[PDB]
Write a protein that binds this ligand. Structure first.
Ligand SMILES: C=CC1=C(C)[C@@H](Cc2[nH]c(/C=C3N=C(/C=C4\NC(=O)[C@H](C)[C@H]4CC)C(C)=C\3CCC(=O)O)c(CCC(=O)O)c2C)NC1=O
Ligand SMILES: C=CC1=C(C)[C@@H](Cc2[nH]c(/C=C3N=C(/C=C4\NC(=O)[C@H](C)[C@H]4CC)C(C)=C\3CCC(=O)O)c(CCC(=O)O)c2C)NC1=O
Ligand SMILES: C=CC1=C(C)[C@@H](Cc2[nH]c(/C=C3N=C(/C=C4\NC(=O)[C@H](C)[C@H]4CC)C(C)=C\3CCC(=O)O)c(CCC(=O)O)c2C)NC1=O
Ligand SMILES: C=CC1=C(C)[C@@H](Cc2[nH]c(/C=C3N=C(/C=C4\NC(=O)[C@H](C)[C@H]4CC)C(C)=C\3CCC(=O)O)c(CCC(=O)O)c2C)NC1=O
Ligand SMILES: C=CC1=C(C)[C@@H](Cc2[nH]c(/C=C3N=C(/C=C4\NC(=O)[C@H](C)[C@H]4CC)C(C)=C\3CCC(=O)O)c(CCC(=O)O)c2C)NC1=O
Ligand SMILES: C=CC1=C(C)[C@@H](Cc2[nH]c(/C=C3N=C(/C=C4\NC(=O)[C@H](C)[C@H]4CC)C(C)=C\3CCC(=O)O)c(CCC(=O)O)c2C)NC1=O
Ligand SMILES: C=CC1=C(C)[C@@H](Cc2[nH]c(/C=C3N=C(/C=C4\NC(=O)[C@H](C)[C@H]4CC)C(C)=C\3CCC(=O)O)c(CCC(=O)O)c2C)NC1=O
Ligand SMILES: C=CC1=C(C)[C@@H](Cc2[nH]c(/C=C3N=C(/C=C4\NC(=O)[C@H](C)[C@H]4CC)C(C)=C\3CCC(=O)O)c(CCC(=O)O)c2C)NC1=O
Ligand SMILES: C=CC1=C(C)[C@@H](Cc2[nH]c(/C=C3N=C(/C=C4\NC(=O)[C@H](C)[C@H]4CC)C(C)=C\3CCC(=O)O)c(CCC(=O)O)c2C)NC1=O
Ligand SMILES: C=CC1=C(C)[C@@H](Cc2[nH]c(/C=C3N=C(/C=C4\NC(=O)[C@H](C)[C@H]4CC)C(C)=C\3CCC(=O)O)c(CCC(=O)O)c2C)NC1=O
Ligand SMILES: C=CC1=C(C)[C@@H](Cc2[nH]c(/C=C3N=C(/C=C4\NC(=O)[C@H](C)[C@H]4CC)C(C)=C\3CCC(=O)O)c(CCC(=O)O)c2C)NC1=O
Ligand SMILES: CCC1=C(C)[C@@H](CC2=N/C(=C\c3[nH]c(C[C@@H]4NC(=O)C(C)=C4CC)c(C)c3CCC(=O)O)C(CCC(=O)O)=C2C)NC1=O
Ligand SMILES: CCC1=C(C)[C@@H](CC2=N/C(=C\c3[nH]c(C[C@@H]4NC(=O)C(C)=C4CC)c(C)c3CCC(=O)O)C(CCC(=O)O)=C2C)NC1=O
Ligand SMILES: CCC1=C(C)[C@@H](CC2=N/C(=C\c3[nH]c(C[C@@H]4NC(=O)C(C)=C4CC)c(C)c3CCC(=O)O)C(CCC(=O)O)=C2C)NC1=O
Lengths: 65, 59, 177, 233, 164, 177, 164, 164, 177
């Protein structure tokens, strides 16, 4: 099976396959999809967004970032 | 025995009026008493008083 | 979760004073309206499944790319989750009609929905279209002007309340966009 | 899975998004049984209350409780290990162990590592995630079509009748887990919700007693062919 | 069995709190709308037999194919089970009118009906045809009363929205 | 969990028929009794902590072996659990007064209580004594005959309802014994 | 903030179900008892200053030892905190009368009051003396009305039973 | 009152002889099986209350129609007579368990029972439900000596086969 | 979980009095016994796995039916659970040597063990044999009379403490039988 860390980072799958019991929005907003960044090459893009975060997995804001 | 083997009466081909359906007793309470014996539902309908004899012997 | 009453009370708490005259006067008009709100919620509840069916079926029939292979309605399970979500949207709108304040609709369902449909890849314009169809159908039931159902109520003007329900559906459709 | 008693009789799950105080209280009663906590113990758990008033990770709440001395004291200090493991199943999962293998698994995860790895093992079960997730308070579930029938019997028998309080009682499932015999029909019967017609089986009488299923009893079976009967053994 | 009483008792019990004035206002409303509900319950217990008879008759009047091949009511026995089922649904509408919530109708009639109906090949649209027939056979001033009549319509509409 | 209404309905369900005229007549007397019931529950609720205080203090002062070292009231924690249990008993009796039927009191609290107090070593006779003190105190508040509080209500006979509340307390006290 | 509306909407929401007729009867009772509650709230917002002043005056009239050594109100400032606290409690009684449950009174006044009061050496019995003074200073027909007066008494009784 | 020694004394007395070595061997077997009988008697006198409590609780768990209406157990007094009757029965099982024959259980409990349970509308099947619950629920290794459990089950089986 | 201190306190609580002179005198003998108990626990701990190995290997070699096919030591997993159980028994006996009272050993491990080994089919006589071998081995380490280890301690009489540890092992071996 999958490590407790690794499961937090990964993803949430589709309903009818991966999880029988439907999920609250809270858990899509809070965990979800969690991508950190490369370093930013320009004065313009640095101070706007945080870099790769550790021991935390954000979701659905990182899509927009 | 009277069983037709290859047989379907369509009852959709009939004229719109002439499909009539009748229920012997239109109630819940009287179709089934609390006890098992019934005159409508189940195999219990086999054990009504009367109908023990037969009138087809006239042929 | 705050009704009309709790909105008056919380506003008077930020103002730090007692309740007073004018706020209670508007709340007397709330109580004064009374049942019209009751019978309105009865009209939107006692047709609700049929509203959801017609609205989502209309959403698909306006935009046949949803049912196209690769669209977000293309599967039975996607379609089931679709119908389920439309049912939930109409449920929270009915809660907002009983309460008289959209704090229940903001705290329960509207909070974190745009990011959810972004996260799932649900097209937002199609959802706003389905919400708009539920809006027009729902106000048509609330004025008792449905073309298939005309139920008996004693006569009375209900423009204000219809504008209120339209405000809740416009809150949802504006929220997903 | 029809789930006959899930919503019809048993009260609804306490989800997070309503008022926090009701979530906190209902989790006290579930995690604890009817513990009946007092002023001191509630002051002693104040930082977990803070962490859960802040973010609603009820999973992390249950973790934080079971790691605390108020839960450790009663159940891990007054109570013997057999009953400790079994109660741990009941408090965290809502359900009993379904087999001797799983009870051996939990005991082994204890004896290899310690208390905290065991607690994180319950809280990190995939079964726990599918039943409860991060957002729903633990509760007793009526699934229907369970994996074992013994899971249902032991789960209901260990989900006590209203007003439970395991602090008086003694461990009823140890011989039951190791033997594989399901518990007494009376305790199962006492714990079922209202309207389930509690224990109207138990055919007793001059004829048809059949009070205890007996494993060793030989198996008989008769079918009717137009000639007569075939008995298959 | 959900009602006003069980909702506020269940809620105040869930809080562990004594029943405040809010619960008292809720049961105050129950004893306000009570007279209408009991009026419609009395009249339904009056003429239930004609209601069930006309209901099932319109049910086979629409869908005639049931008594044709049928994978449906295909005997006088199954038509007796038909009118028994309509007797049960009207009896649960009576029970829900007396309780005044959708409690006994949901826990006795609606809960898990869908597995029985998809398992035993029973179409729901026939039931819906029956209930929509009864709902169209209502009267505003004639048979019950205006207000209690509305209560009855609501209960029957709940059945339809639970079935479709 | 069953009120008056649900008792009539369940009995008519075992009888398999419609509810009928006489049962609805008794239920009209229930609704008809009304506000008497409401104000009665208001009387038992709005004095309840004080009832529990007086009753348990009376229980200890009548039987001084409870506070004796080795008794089941001898600790602060045992005394707090004692007050807590008396508060819960009065809570479910108040629920049984709102419902009109003791199904809530039988399903919530009463079922499995004698085995609990047997399992804990709680003396049952002392509990029945405390229940009896809550009974007399509670009926004294319900007739508005308290010697320290006389609150204003419109006058009216309530013998029936007092007999009902005494029936619930006698159900509890008979149940623990 | 608990009321009839939040109880039934919270309950129907917890079931995931549309609001049935039962919820509608509950809010029907809320709009029945509404006029009484709002009458008492209007009159309380009328003369609250005299109510709070007489309340605190009787509060020190009972317990004189507070203004003696005191480990209590031992300045004019702390007596101003006293009359401020009674202003707050009357203002929350006003709020609970407008909402018509014990919601804002419980979540703003009662919740966590006991830690503050045992931390800052404040006796509860002095508050109880104040409120029992006001509750004894009620009138049957004179100041409010019979029925609404009862409503007011209930709210204040709740405060006392939450404090003792 | 039948026991080993009363049977052999009464038998030799009916003979008209001194007790020979056969009676002496019989009472020798009495003082062989004695220790297991008295062990079972000690434990029964130990927890009789919980045994009778589980017996009556399972007896009304199995049968619920006793509680409603005309049938016995409806009121608290009749159910107190119920647990009193099962108290008598376990006390007679203790007595016959000490004596070692079915004598006191027969003459005090069984003799003429049928007219009494027949006349007073008392069903015997509920008694059998109580005893078969106390018969099924015991472990010989855990709470009693191996021989004692056999003795207890034997006595209880006698009660059941004498009842119906 | 009760040490010697908690035994004195609980006995004085049932007596309902203060602590007094004689009980504190015996507890002074406990604290003066002190470093002998400390070094004794050090001796039983710092050889413990080897004690369990020798004891269970001796149990098998005395009774070779355990390793016979069908016996309860016949598998690798049965043998591992066997060594694990012996290790746990020695662990709680070491706890009972630190505490000075067998309340920890009675509440943790001893309560519900006979019915467990009955439920598993574990032969009880073989377990009591293994407990007896751990007893003799443990007292041989506690007198520093081991034939393979003689570690340096200052000399002195320790008969009382050895009788105490033998009382705990006899409690376990008497408990499984
Ligand atoms: C399902 C797939 C799956 C994986 C692929 C792993 C990935 C993974 N590795 C670690 C954890 C770890 N992984 C390594 C491995 C490393 N040691 C080094 O010297 C190298 C850089 C590297 C091997 C090439 C180490 C050392 C840890 C522990 C790190 C630490 O605690 O400091 C953890 C955290 C949990 C733990 O401590 O085990 C996870 C999730 N786990 C999974 O569940
Ligand atoms: C061009 C260079 C460049 C950087 C170096 C970052 C630096 C940086 N980080 C954050 C922001 C952040 N950075 C972290 C990171 C941390 N989490 C922890 O547990 C650790 C202490 C630490 C990683 C080692 C976190 C958690 C935030 C969000 C903080 C918050 O919102 O509370 C922000 C504010 C904007 C944002 O929220 O993204 C900025 C400017 N951004 C840049 O543009
Ligand atoms: C418990 C359930 C419950 C309900 C469902 C309502 C039902 C209800 N509605 C009205 C009464 C009314 N209901 C409406 C409603 C409207 N009229 C229109 O033409 C529009 C189509 C519609 C918009 C919502 C109007 C206009 C009145 C009359 C005006 C009024 O009483 O305010 C009345 C007053 C009494 C009577 O008319 O006999 C009642 C009881 N009240 C309840 O207690
Ligand atoms: C893994 C195996 C497995 C099984 C074999 C079942 C066994 C089983 N059945 C029920 C429960 C039930 N089982 C039946 C079935 C019956 N209806 C009758 O008319 C007949 C006597 C009988 C079919 C032949 C009914 C009616 C219930 C619900 C009983 C009730 O709630 O009153 C329950 C309780 C939970 C529930 O309500 O679903 C369980 C554990 N479940 C499992 O997990
Ligand atoms: C408490 C409420 C309650 C109900 C509402 C019913 C609902 C119900 N109906 C049937 C069962 C049935 N119901 C019908 C009825 C129908 N015949 C048709 O032509 C129409 C479509 C329809 C009447 C309008 C029939 C024909 C069956 C038997 C189906 C079959 O065996 O093929 C069954 C399965 C058990 C049985 O065979 O009786 C159930 C649970 N039962 C209940 O306990
Ligand atoms: C839902 C209903 C419901 C109840 C009715 C109670 C019943 C109840 N009381 C106790 C527990 C207790 N109850 C009491 C009460 C008593 N003190 C005495 O002096 C008197 C004899 C008696 C009050 C009249 C005491 C003292 C305890 C603690 C007993 C102990 O720990 O020794 C327990 C065990 C859990 C605990 O410690 O809290 C339970 C289940 N709990 C519930 O959940
Ligand atoms: C929502 C909460 C709520 C309540 C708590 C009640 C409170 C209440 N009771 C009455 C009214 C009444 N209440 C009682 C009750 C009493 N009879 C006596 O012998 C005792 C002193 C007392 C029961 C303990 C009586 C007798 C009346 C009628 C008084 C009269 O008409 O003389 C009234 C006036 C309207 C009416 O006549 O019904 C009200 C508002 N109503 C509510 O809406
Ligand atoms: C929203 C509701 C609400 C309340 C009801 C109050 C309650 C309250 N009172 C105090 C605080 C206080 N309250 C009093 C009042 C008292 N003086 C006495 O002589 C009497 C016993 C008593 C008046 C009857 C005093 C004296 C203090 C200050 C205590 C101190 O600092 O020693 C505090 C701590 C913060 C502070 O110092 O102000 C709070 C929370 N505050 C709120 O926000
Ligand atoms: C020495 C042995 C010995 C016994 C075993 C009892 C047997 C016994 N029981 C009753 C009498 C009774 N016994 C019961 C008991 C029952 N209630 C029910 O619901 C159940 C069917 C059943 C418990 C399982 C009841 C209710 C009565 C009173 C019957 C009545 O008066 O209607 C009587 C008549 C005298 C009386 O009223 O007490 C006798 C002789 N008495 C003895 O002296
Ligand atoms: C005088 C005679 C006499 C008896 C014969 C016993 C019979 C008996 N056993 C239990 C009680 C019990 N008896 C058992 C025994 C069992 N465990 C299992 O795995 C097996 C099925 C079975 C052993 C073969 C258990 C486990 C309990 C506790 C049940 C529970 O609390 O869940 C109780 C309830 C009180 C208690 O908890 O101790 C009683 C009366 N008691 C007596 O006074
Ligand atoms: C913090 C850790 C710590 C320890 C491990 C002990 C170690 C230790 N033991 C003793 C002292 C002692 N230790 C023993 C023990 C022994 N008796 C024998 O028969 C065996 C050889 C052996 C037990 C296995 C004895 C008998 C004494 C007293 C020696 C003497 O006075 O002759 C002393 C000197 C002080 C005293 O008299 O107590 C110390 C420091 N003390 C500590 O503070
Ligand atoms: C071919 C694919 C297709 C559909 C499916 C429909 C779906 C549909 N229904 C509408 C709107 C709509 N739908 C209904 C409900 C409906 N009418 C009734 O009288 C009864 C009993 C109903 C349920 C059975 C009402 C009441 C309205 C409001 C208009 C009206 O007055 O009828 C609207 C208008 C939306 C708007 O105003 O923005 C659409 C698009 N249209 C399509 O093109
Ligand atoms: C010294 C240890 C001790 C106590 C503590 C009391 C407790 C006590 N209260 C009683 C009974 C009792 N208690 C109250 C309630 C109480 N009275 C009020 O007027 C108000 C406002 C109350 C709560 C503050 C009432 C109303 C009664 C009924 C008698 C009466 O009319 O006052 C009774 C009589 C019980 C019976 O009738 O069987 C007792 C024993 N007695 C003691 O010996
Ligand atoms: C051939 C199958 C077989 C075995 C396996 C052994 C097992 C064994 N060890 C004993 C007893 C025993 N065992 C040890 C422990 C052991 N010795 C040490 O010095 C060290 C370092 C140890 C762990 C490595 C001690 C200390 C004793 C006490 C005797 C002694 O002084 O050595 C005893 C005596 C039991 C008794 O007194 O009743 C037995 C039977 N015997 C067998 O026949």
């Amino acid at each position: 099976v999958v490590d407790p860390f690794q499961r937090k980072f990964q993803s949430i799958g589709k309903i009818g396959i991966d999880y029988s019991r439907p999920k609250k929005l809270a858990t899509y907003k809070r965990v979800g999809y969690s991508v950190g960044l490369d370093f930013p090459n320009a004065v313009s893009m640095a101070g706007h967004y945080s870099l790769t975060d550790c021991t935390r997995a954000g979701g659905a804001a990182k899509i927009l970032m | 025995i009277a069983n037709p083997d290859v047989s379907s009466v369509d009852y959709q081909l009939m004229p719109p009026g002439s499909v009539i359906v009748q229920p012997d007793e239109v109630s819940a309470a009287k179709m089934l008493p609390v006890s098992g014996m019934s005159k409508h539902i189940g195999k219990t309908k086999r054990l009504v008083e009367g109908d023990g004899l037969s009138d087809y012997s006239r042929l | 979760m705050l009704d009309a009453f709790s909105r008056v009370v919380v506003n008077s708490d930020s103002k730090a004073a007692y309740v007073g005259g004018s706020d209670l006067q508007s709340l007397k008009t709330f109580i004064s309206d009374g049942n019209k709100r009751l019978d309105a919620v009865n009209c939107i509840v006692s047709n609700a499944s049929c509203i959801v069916s017609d609205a989502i079926s209309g959403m698909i029939c306006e935009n046949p790319g949803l049912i196209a292979p690769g669209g977000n309605c293309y599967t039975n399970r996607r379609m089931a989750a679709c119908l389920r979500d439309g049912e939930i949207i109409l449920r929270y709108v009915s809660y907002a009609l009983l309460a008289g304040d959209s704090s229940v609709l903001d705290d329960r369902c509207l909070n974190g929905l745009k990011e959810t449909y972004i996260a799932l890849g649900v097209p937002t314009a199609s959802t706003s279209r389905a919400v708009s169809i539920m809006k027009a159908a729902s106000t048509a039931f609330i004025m008792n002007t449905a073309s298939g159902r005309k139920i008996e109520i004693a006569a009375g003007d209900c423009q204000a309340l219809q504008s209120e329900a339209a405000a809740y559906f416009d809150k949802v459709g504006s929220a997903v966009d | 899975a029809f789930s006959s008693i899930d919503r019809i009789l048993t009260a609804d799950p306490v989800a997070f998004p309503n008022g926090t105080e009701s979530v906190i209280r209902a989790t006290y009663i579930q995690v604890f049984g009817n513990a009946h906590v007092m002023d001191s113990e509630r002051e002693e758990l104040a930082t977990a209350e803070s962490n859960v008033c802040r973010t609603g990770n009820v999973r992390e709440f249950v973790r934080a409780i079971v790691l605390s001395e108020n839960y450790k004291s009663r159940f891990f200090y007054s109570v013997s290990q057999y009953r400790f493991i079994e109660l741990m199943f009941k408090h965290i999962l809502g359900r009993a162990p379904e087999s001797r293998a799983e009870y051996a698994e939990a005991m082994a995860v204890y004896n290899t590592k310690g208390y905290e790895p065991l607690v994180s093992w319950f809280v990190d079960s995939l079964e726990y995630n599918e039943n409860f997730g991060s957002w729903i308070v633990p509760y007793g579930i009526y699934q229907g079509c369970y994996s074992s029938n013994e899971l249902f019997n032991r789960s209901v028998a260990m989900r006590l009748a209203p007003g439970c309080s395991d602090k008086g009682r003694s461990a009823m499932l140890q011989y039951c887990v190791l033997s594989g015999d399901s518990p007494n029909w009376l305790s199962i019967s006492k714990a079922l919700p209202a309207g389930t017609e509690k224990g109207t089986g138990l055919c007793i009488g001059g004829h048809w007693q059949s009070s205890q299923r007996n494993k060793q009893a030989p198996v008989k079976g008769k079918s009717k062919i137009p000639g007569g009967v075939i008995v298959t053994e | 069995m959900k009602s006003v009483i069980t909702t506020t008792i269940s809620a105040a019990d869930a809080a562990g709190r004594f029943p405040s004035s809010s619960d008292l206002e809720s049961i105050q409303g129950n004893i306000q709308r009570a007279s209408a509900r009991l009026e419609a319950a009395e009249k339904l217990s009056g003429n239930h037999e004609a209601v069930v008879k006309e209901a099932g008759d319109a049910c086979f009047a629409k869908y005639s194919y049931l008594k044709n091949s049928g994978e449906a009511g295909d005997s006088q026995e199954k038509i007796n089970k038909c009118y028994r089922d309509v007797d049960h649904y009207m009896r649960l509408i009576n029970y829900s009118l007396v309780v005044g919530g959708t409690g006994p109708l949901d826990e006795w009639g609606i809960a898990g009906s869908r597995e029985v109906y998809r398992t035993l090949n029973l179409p729901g649209s026939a039931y819906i045809a029956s209930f929509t027939f009864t709902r169209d056979r209502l009267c505003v001033p004639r048979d019950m009363s205006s207000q209690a009549g509305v209560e009855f319509v609501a209960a029957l509409d709940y059945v339809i929205n639970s079935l479709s």
